[PDB]
From Swiss-Prot:
Protein kinase domain ranges (all copies): 11-261
Family from the record: Belongs to the protein kinase superfamily. Ser/Thr protein kinase family.
Residues at the catalytic site: D133
Primary role: Involved in mitotic spindle assembly checkpoint signaling, a process that delays anaphase until chromosomes are bioriented on the spindle, and in the repair of incorrect mitotic kinetochore-spindle microtubule attachments. Phosphorylates MAD1L1 to promote the mitotic spindle assembly checkpoint. Phosphorylates CDCA8/Borealin leading to enhanced AURKB activity at the kinetochore. Phosphorylates SKA3 at 'Ser-34' leading to dissociation of the SKA complex from microtubules and destabilization of microtubule-kinetochore attachments. Phosphorylates KNL1, KNTC1 and autophosphorylates.
Gene: TTK
Protein name: Dual specificity protein kinase TTK
Assembly description: Interacts with TPR; the interactions occurs in a microtubule-independent manner. Interacts with MAD1L1 and MAD2L1.
Native source organism of the sequence: Homo sapiens (Human)
Included stretch of the parent chain: 515 to 795 of 857
Tissues expressing this chain: Present in rapidly proliferating cell lines.
Domain of life per record: Eukaryota
UniProt: ATP binding residues: I17, G18, S19, G20, G21, S22, S23, K24, V25, K39
Length: 265
C-alpha cells in the first residue's frame, strides 16, 4: 500500500523495478489504474556534479521527446532540493533482460528493433549528445517498440556487475592521457547489440577474462567472426558497424540508407 504523489496526482506502487545510486524506479498506477514508471532520486547525499547530471537528463528528456517517440516519455516531474520524482512511460521490460531470456529472435522483429534503436540514437545525436556507453539495458520494450531511456549522463541503474562487452576501441585507447567524443562510438555499441541479436552473443563474449577481452577489442588482427547468414544485408551491417577504425566505421545517417533498413525482405 506504499504511495507516491507527484504534482497533484497520487500513484500506487506495484513494485520496484530497479535501483542504482540514490535512485529507484517503481512500477505504479494512477488514479485510474493506468500504469507508469516513477524514478525517484534522493538528492540529500548528492554533490553539485551529480545534481547537474540529473538536471541535464530532465532537460534533454523534456526537449528530446517532441522529436521522437522512440525516446521514453516523461509526462511530469517534480524536483526540489531534497528529491526528484519523474513520471514516465513504463516499459514491459528492458532489452538486456529480454535477451537473456535467450529465446528465439524473429528476423522481422530484430530488423524493426534495429530501426527503433537507430532512430532514437539518431535524434540524440542531432541535439549534440553522444551516449558513449550504450547497452541493451538502455532500451525498453513498449508496444512492440524499442525506446531509449538514458542519455548516458546520469547514474545508470540495475534491475532489482556492469558490462564491458559493448565498449568501443576508441574508449580503451583514449585512456592514455583533444580526446573527442565521436558519434561513431555509439555505432560500435549498437553494432554489438545487433550482433548479440543475430548470433546470440557479444562479439568478444567468449573471452571470459576481462583484461584480455579489452585487448581483443583494440587489436586489429583479432578477427571478429561473422558466420554466413541468410540475411546478407544484416551481415554487412554488422561488418560496417564493428570496424575498429571509427573513421571507416559506418555512420548513423549511412545506416539509415542501408538496404537492411530500407528494403523490407
Ligand atoms: C526490467 N523492467 C523494466 C521495466 N520497465 C521500465 N523500466 C525502467 N527502468 C529500468 C530500471 C532497471 C534497469 C532497466 C530499466 C523505466 C524507466 C527508467 N529509468 C522509465 N520507464 C521504465 N520502465 C519492466 N521491467
Amino acid at each position: 500500500n506504499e504511495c507516491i504523489s507527484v504534482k497533484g496526482r497520487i500513484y500506487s506502487i506495484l513494485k520496484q523495478i530497479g535501483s542504482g545510486g540514490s535512485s529507484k524506479v517503481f512500477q505504479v498506477l494512477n488514479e485510474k489504474k493506468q500504469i507508469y514508471a516513477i524514478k525517484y532520486v534522493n538528492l540529500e547525499e548528492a554533490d553539485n556534479q551529480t545534481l547537474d547530471s540529473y538536471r541535464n537528463e530532465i532537460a534533454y528528456l523534456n526537449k528530446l521527446q517532441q522529436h521522437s517517440d522512440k525516446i521514453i516519455r516523461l509526462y511530469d516531474y517534480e524536483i526540489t532540493d531534497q528529491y526528484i520524482y519523474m513520471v514516465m512511460e513504463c516499459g514491459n521490460i528492458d532489452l538486456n533482460s529480454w535477451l537473456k531470456k535467450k529465446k528465439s529472435i524473429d528476423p522481422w522483429e530484430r530488423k524493426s528493433y534495429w530501426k527503433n534503436m537507430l532512430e532514437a540514437v539518431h535524434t540524440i545525436h542531432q541535439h549534440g549528445i553522444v551516449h558513449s556507453d550504450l547497452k541493451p539495458a538502455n532500451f525498453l520494450i513498449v508496444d512492440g517498440m524499442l525506446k531509449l531511456i538514458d542519455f548516458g549522463i546520469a547514474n545508470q541503474m540495475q534491475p532489482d556487475v556492469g558490462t564491458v562487452n559493448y565498449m568501443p576501441p576508441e574508449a580503451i585507447k583514449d585512456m592514455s592521457s583533444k580526446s573527442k567524443i565521436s558519434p561513431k562510438s555509439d555505432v560500435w555499441s549498437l553494432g554489438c547489440i545487433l550482433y548479440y541479436m543475430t548470433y546470440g552473443k557479444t562479439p568478444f563474449q567468449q573471452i571470459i577474462n576481462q583484461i584480455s577481452k579489452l585487448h581483443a577489442i583494440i587489436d586489429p588482427n583479432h578477427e571478429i567472426e561473422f558466420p554466413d547468414i541468410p540475411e546478407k544485408d544484416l551481415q554487412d551491417v554488422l561488418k560496417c558497424c564493428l570496424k575498429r577504425d571509427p573513421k571507416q566505421r559506418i555512420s548513423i545517417p549511412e545506416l539509415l540508407a542501408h538496404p537492411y533498413v530500407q528494403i523490407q525482405t
